[PDB]
């Protein structure tokens, strides 16, 4: 039920790092 | 604050939702 949420969650950190310089 | 500091926090945060998705999974 959360499960979508979740997973979108960790793409928002992971496009949030992408952005990122290392 | 540090860009290298919140890419490792964010690399490693991601990390353990990644597992806790894992082990709902």
Sequence with gaps: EX???XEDX???XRKX???XRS
């Design 10 to 12: 960790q793409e928002r």
């Design 3 to 5: 499960y979508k949420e």
């Design 17 to 19: 790092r992408k952005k």
